[PDB]
From a paper:
We focus on LASV lineages of public health concern including lineage II, one of the most common lineages that circulates widely in southern Nigeria; lineage V, which circulates in Mali and has decreased pathogenicity compared with lineage IV; and lineage VII, a newly described lineage isolated from a nosocomial infection in Togo with comparable pathogenicity to lineage IV. The resulting soluble constructs feature sequences of circulating lineages II (LII; strain NIG08-A41), V (LV; strain Soromba-R), and VII (LVII; strain Togo/2016/7082). Combined, these approaches enabled us to determine the structures of GPC in a reproducible manner and yielded structures of LIV, LII, LV, and LVII GPC trimers at resolutions of 3.8, 3.7, 3.7, and 3.1 Å, respectively. LII, LV, and LVII each have an additional PNGS at residue N271 or N272, though this site is uniformly unoccupied. Similarly, when comparing the GPCs of diverse lineages, we observe high structural homology. Using the prototypical LIV GPC as reference, we note RMSDs for pruned and all sequence-aligned pair as follows: 0.78 and 1.9 (LII), 0.85 and 2.0 (LV), and 0.73 and 2.4 Å (LVII). The main differences among the GPC lineages are found in flexible loops, most notably the loop (residues 166–181) extending from the β7 sheet prior to the α3 helix. This observed heterogeneity is derived from areas in the EM map of poorer local resolution, insinuating greater flexibility of the residues in these regions. Consequently, these differences may not represent physiologically important conformational epitopes for LII, LV, and LVII GPCs.
The LASV glycoprotein complex (GPC) mediates viral entry and is the sole target for neutralizing antibodies. In its mature, native form, GPC is a trimer of heterotrimers comprised of the receptor-engaging subunit GP1; the transmembrane-spanning subunit GP2, which contains the GPC’s fusion peptide at its N terminus; and the stable signal peptide (SSP), which remains non-covalently complexed near the membrane-proximal region of GP2 post-cleavage. The GPC is expressed as a single polypeptide precursor before being proteolytically processed by signal peptidase (SPase)21 followed by site-1 protease (S1P). We present the development and characterization of prefusion-stabilized, trimeric GPCs of LASV lineages II, V, and VII, revealing structural conservation despite sequence diversity.
Residue numbers in the entry:
A (entry chain B), C (entry chain A), E (entry chain C): 59 to 254
B (entry chain b), D (entry chain a), F (entry chain c): 259 to 423
The structure:
């Protein structure tokens, strides 16, 4: 407790919720449910599941923009997420449907029967999980089957990552809110592409 | 005035010194005030997690008091402002440490030394985490001991030259 | 004047024109006329007007490049400007015509009858003005109807922004020359795009 | 030699010290020379508007004396060189301050303190502007007073240790 | 040797080969042969020659990705190289053929009879040499006909730059291995494009 | 513990101090150890070529001892890690100097001063090259002399305050 003479060790813990009107805040409820607050009233829900909700592959992105019915904050976040997924060319893995400006995005990952493998390093499933790990950094560690991997060969038991617009309800029982995940993604984004 | 970091945008200070953290900045424990001597370290120090959080909090305050007019939804300001608010290098260091099972800062908890004989406090340092939890006080013992030495050294240097003329 | 003892407050003002051979310099003549020096002899004129000069929408960019008749410094600046305009997908707003390598670029902004509104935040007109504000930073403040907006919902009375190649004639009566506008744009550029 | 900032590329210095600003760098007032002690602060200080202008001016000189061969139109060099010449973070801070009606630096005018008893001068600081004009000397009074104290402190520290042995 | 009192000037030279398992290392054998180690066993050979090896222009990049038969480290390096070539739109200058995942890339530069000229500044040949200069920085200086140019108007006697996968054989007789060339390219990449 | 630069990720130090360079880090000359006083300068100094090499070497070690599991081919880690390991601004300065026929650092060779009366050594500085070779010791004479003065100054300051109380 007391170091050297009379220097007492003291602590402080920060309340990052007061930053919700200027910055989005990520938090975790449990291993399959992660959230982003994007303002005082609303946010995004990120779910790791075994059930698809989108059964087509149109992903009507250009039409969402022409119609302009979506919330812009939510769209900026989705763009940041997507742009940062390294080496994503496999568009058949992504499906979205902005019906009425509603946001619903699904990433279908090839979480194959990798009982004992380190092959699934060069795949889409890894690229999507990497972005996820950063967005929910600090709570995302319980979402994976593995531990201290290099995040460049990580796997989970779940097959789909579904991102949807929600109403904020303070679902942060596992990890506290923090702006770091998003800010740390904005700073780099599109630095993993292949043209040669 | 005193500070050159983000706070300086509007002079800030809040009080004569210490850039006090209010009761809504902290989780419990009401108010905490530091000395200008320690807070001012953020004027020069770039790669420090505590200083970055102060920069973000002060920004949030300024962005609410002023420029509250753009439909009260300027949540996008940060997409550019961030370049002037935080050191993303620190974020990368913490991500790398996480990948390697090296204790890392998740930015929620900080520790500092408080000289009970004066009220002089150090700039907070990040309490690190590893394997889902916080590290024990027995870890960091080298860092805590060094901060205590640093506080002692500054007190002595100040008196050697400024007390004695 | 004298602080503490004998410390006298002194000033200096910098002549940034001597930097014209290494850096472009922006300056302002009046609210509707802004300029960029791009070398010792030539530059660009940026005019805020109510009169279009281009009455078509071809914007023959790829042909300008195949022909290669344009000055490269001027083209690099135009690219930087354009790339930095956030969320620009509305190509019908832009028209250009590089006839003989001449540079003439027009941006047609939807400066609607926004007598009392804060709707024109999510529009093209705002995205173009934002880039403008930065390029002519330090003089651009008189170009707008509004004051300290967040530059993310700003409007002007003018409908077109026209950029053309000119001969440098020292048209800097409102604000002094400075390299900062351009350098501060080069540093960031393409950091506002939407894919999701 | 003495400086580590851009000037160091070719040693520079110009004179025995002070990295003198010539009559074409300044608007009026002929020449101004600073002390190495103040100019050298730019060796460590990254986020300072005055230091960035010095970096750009020295670059411009070097890019004219040397490497004048590429058709005398290497106006594009800066598109890459800028990363090593200025702190774009400062530019962002000044843009943010502008948006919020916070006085900001537009880089044209600087102030410094000149000790009339010695000729020792401080590193210049940016004179800020707000609402289309320059701020009055009554503003900044805290900053001017602090710079005067800082100059006093350095003079004293130098004598305490180096004059007295 | 001894400065002031008893301060002796001492030196150290670093062995950067021990970094080969974490970073690629560039080195030079002679003026026409430059190498990149990309791991403990393999690397890339970069040759400046007068003989083409690819006599077509298909450059089957998208098929290389669909097949996924190539080494990923080698491909990441090729992407970085290519992306960093400023103003590259002249795709007819590039040809590649990833047969079986093998890497073979050829850049055909218009090294015209520039006996006395400073015209070849705005060309492809210069853009490709610029990237080359950085990748083999520290040894690349002997690859050019000219000296301290601004690297924005440099020429060589060679017409082709050929990049191929090799086996590492320590071909570093002219300049020592160093990670700097590559790291210094990763940091900037795509900062020279024209859209206007 | 002592260092805050990359080394701090796993405390490091290697020995009680000096962050010793092993025989495989150097070309010949077996081992070299510095003092904590000099190595620690990299805690604050960002734009120094020697410090960047130390950051890369320590990273390489950590990335081999730990996290050796990802098929032993995580050669791609650096594509992101680099942002937290080196100052690319230095790389640009050296490229600019090369273009202008200004001696530049190619990162292979460094020099330092060694006080033969104590074993105290300075942080190494880059030996520069120009026109295909290394510069002579007659060049840099101003820089070598300044480093010798700096070492003298630190020795004196330490004794003035800490030896004498
Ligand atoms: C940096 O790393 C550190 C180290 O991991 C992270 O620190 C952790 O952060 C979390 C999130 O804030 C802390 O969780 C909180 O723990 C409280 C105490 O829990 C225990 O006691 C209570 C007593 O009632 C028991 O009920 C609990 O057991 C139940 O909950 C756990 C949850 O994990 C389940 O696993 C169990 O099975 C049980 O179901 C524990 O024994 C806990 O009370 C608190 O939960 C409330 O608050 C949250 C957030 O506001 C609400 O979402 C939640 O619904 C609860 O809210 C109700 O109750 C409060 C009571 O005060 C009312 O005020 C509300 O209105 C409402 O009715 C939460 O679970 C965790 O303790 C902490 N770990 C350590 C070691 O410190 C940092 O977050 C991380 N930083 C970042 C940025 O990532
Ligand atoms: C950071 O912010 C600060 C704060 O705003 C900016 O500071 C301002 O910068 C401008 C631009 O340099 C300064 O403007 C100059 O003011 C001179 C003085 O003007 C007054 O006196 C003259 C006396 O003759 C009157 O004629 C003027 O009135 C007329 O002009 C104003 C212009 O705004 C009109 O509004 C009026 O209606 C009148 O028409 C004023 O009463 C002024 O002389 C000077 O103009 C000459 O120089 C410029 C630039 O070289 C020429 O373009 C212009 O044509 C003039 O040149 C002729 O005259 C000179 C005489 O010396 C000859 O040498 C030439 O060859 C030629 O014949 C200019 O308008 C402004 O004063 C200053 N404000 C403050 C508070 O300091 C910084 O710029 C900004 N920094 C950055 C980077 O943005
Ligand atoms: C920053 O800038 C500086 C300044 O330019 C660069 O410094 C240079 O770096 C190079 C590369 O390491 C140094 O080259 C080495 O020089 C050795 C000595 O050469 C002389 O003596 C030998 C005696 O045998 C003669 O044979 C040589 O002549 C022959 O080689 C030269 C090569 O350029 C030809 O031009 C001649 O025509 C001759 O053919 C010279 O007179 C030299 O021994 C060494 O070569 C061996 O090592 C390399 C690398 O490992 C092998 O690739 C090569 O095949 C040789 O290896 C055999 O021999 C060794 C013997 O020890 C065995 O151990 C091996 O197993 C194998 O059998 C190499 O050429 C150069 O001297 C140095 N310049 C200065 C001024 O210091 C920095 O690199 C640069 N930094 C960066 C990052 O770019
Ligand atoms: C998401 O982010 C927002 C932004 O930070 C947070 O909202 C802030 O919450 C704090 C705490 O509740 C607010 O501060 C308090 O405001 C009370 C109301 O008066 C203010 O607001 C009215 C307009 O509604 C103004 O006219 C008035 O002038 C004030 O500005 C004050 O009464 C409070 O002071 C008194 O009570 C407190 C105890 O609650 C005592 O400690 C004080 O000493 C005093 O007696 C206090 O000032 C703040 O204003 C809110 N900001 C905004 C912009 O609305 C959200 O809380 C956050 N979400 C979460 C979960 O934290
Ligand atoms: C756009 O940017 C350019 C680049 O900075 C500026 O051009 C510089 O302008 C200054 C001031 O006029 C020049 O400096 C002066 O040059 C005179 C001419 O001699 C030089 O040039 C010839 C070749 O033309 C060389 O052979 C010779 O060796 C010199 O290098 C000198 O005579 C001047 O010195 C004398 O007169 C001045 C008063 O004018 C006195 O103060 C001196 O003490 C001395 O008696 C002086 O050196 C500089 O050379 C120009 N640079 C270039 C590259 O040409 C433009 O001015 C700028 N645009 C604007 C509007 O500012
Ligand atoms: C996720 O976002 C969607 C919007 O894309 C939310 O559902 C729909 O939200 C709109 C408002 O944006 C509701 O419109 C309402 O229409 C009535 C007239 O019929 C009008 O009186 C109301 O004032 C309002 O404009 C729409 O009804 C609503 N859809 C449904 C089925 O209720 C959705 O709720 C968001 N998800 C979550 C979890 O919050
Ligand atoms: C998410 O991606 C997986 C693949 O990683 C998709 O599963 C695959 O679906 C195809 C059909 O589209 C299966 O092929 C064949 O289908 C016919 C029925 O049409 C069946 O009779 C054949 O025997 C065969 O199964 C393929 O085997 C299956 N792959 C695996 C590993 O099961 C999945 O449908 C995608 N989910 C969504 C929502 O898009
Ligand atoms: C904006 O740029 C255009 C060029 O794109 C300038 O107009 C034209 O400039 C060219 C030179 O680039 C002039 O060419 C001349 O042709 C005669 C032969 O007829 C030759 O003897 C000259 O040496 C030169 O090569 C062209 O005549 C000129 N166009 C006109 C109508 O005069 C334009 O002036 C620039 N705008 C401003 C305001 O400076
Ligand atoms: C710049 O953009 C504005 C729109 O923001 C353009 O003005 C619009 O022009 C269309 C015609 O292309 C007008 O629609 C109809 O035109 C017919 C004539 O063909 C007329 O009989 C109808 O009554 C109707 O006006 C549209 O109303 C008009 N919008 C506004 C707000 O006036 C403008 O032409 C564009 N300028 C350039 C140079 O492209
Ligand atoms: C440059 O890369 C190519 C590969 O793209 C290297 O050539 C080929 O490499 C593959 C292995 O990647 C060899 O495959 C072998 O097949 C036999 C069965 O026939 C199997 O038993 C072996 O274990 C192995 O899988 C392939 O034979 C080889 N091609 C030739 C003609 O030998 C090429 O060698 C690399 N270049 C350099 C200079 O190293
Ligand atoms: C690399 O690029 C150069 C151009 O910079 C290519 O050389 C050019 O090749 C064309 C033919 O494709 C030559 O045009 C004509 O070809 C016919 C034969 O089909 C001949 O009878 C005509 O007299 C005429 O030569 C063109 O002149 C030639 N350019 C030069 C400067 O020699 C070269 O083939 C390209 N290399 C590769 C591997 O693609
Ligand atoms: C914005 O933040 C305020 C609090 O700062 C929220 O206020 C709550 O509103 C509900 C009614 O919808 C009340 O029952 C609560 O008591 C209020 N809370 C407090 C602390 O007073 C508000 O709901 C938030 N969202 C919006 C859209 O304004």
């Amino acid at each position: 407790l007391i170091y050297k003479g009379s220097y007492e060790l003291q602590t402080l813990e920060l309340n990052m919720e007061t930053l919700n009107m200027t910055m989005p805040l990520s938090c975790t409820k449990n291993s399959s449910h992660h959230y982003i607050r994007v303002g005082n009233e609303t946010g995004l829900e990120l779910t790791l599941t075994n059930t698809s909700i989108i059964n087509h592959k149109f992903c009507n992105l250009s039409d969402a923009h022409k119609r302009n019915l979506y919330d812009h904050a939510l769209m900026s976040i989705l763009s940041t997420f997507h742009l940062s997924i390294p080496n994503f060319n496999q568009y058949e893995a992504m499906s979205c449907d902005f019906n009425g400006g509603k946001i619903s995005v699904q990433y279908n990952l090839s979480h194959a029967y990798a009982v004992d493998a380190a092959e699934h390093c060069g795949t889409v499933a890894n690229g999507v999980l990497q972005t996820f790990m950063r967005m929910a950094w600090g709570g995302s560690y319980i979402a994976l089957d593995s531990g201290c991997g290099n995040w460049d060969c990580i796997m989970t038991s779940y097959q789909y990552l579904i991102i949807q617009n929600t109403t904020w309800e303070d679902h942060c029982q596992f990890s506290r809110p923090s702006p770091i995940g998003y800010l740390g993604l904005l700073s780099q984004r599109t630095r993993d592409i292949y043209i040669s | 005035g005193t500070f050159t970091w983000t706070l300086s945008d509007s002079e800030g200070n809040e009080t004569p010194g210490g850039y006090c953290l209010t009761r809504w900045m902290l989780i419990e424990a009401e108010l905490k005030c530091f000395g200008n001597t320690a807070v001012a370290k953020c004027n020069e120090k770039h790669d420090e997690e505590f200083c970055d959080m102060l920069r973000l909090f002060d920004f949030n305050k300024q962005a609410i008091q002023r420029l509250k007019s753009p439909a009260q939804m300027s949540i996008q300001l940060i997409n550019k402002a961030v370049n002037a608010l935080i050191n993303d290098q620190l974020i990368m260091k913490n991500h790398l440490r996480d990948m390697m099972c090296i204790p890392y800062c998740n930015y929620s908890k900080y520790w500092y030394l408080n000289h009970t004989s004066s009220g002089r406090t150090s700039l907070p340092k990040c309490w690190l985490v590893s394997n889902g939890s916080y590290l024990n006080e027995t870890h960091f013992s080298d860092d805590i001991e060094q901060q205590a030495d640093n506080m002692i050294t500054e007190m002595l240097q100040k008196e050697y030259i400024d007390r004695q003329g």
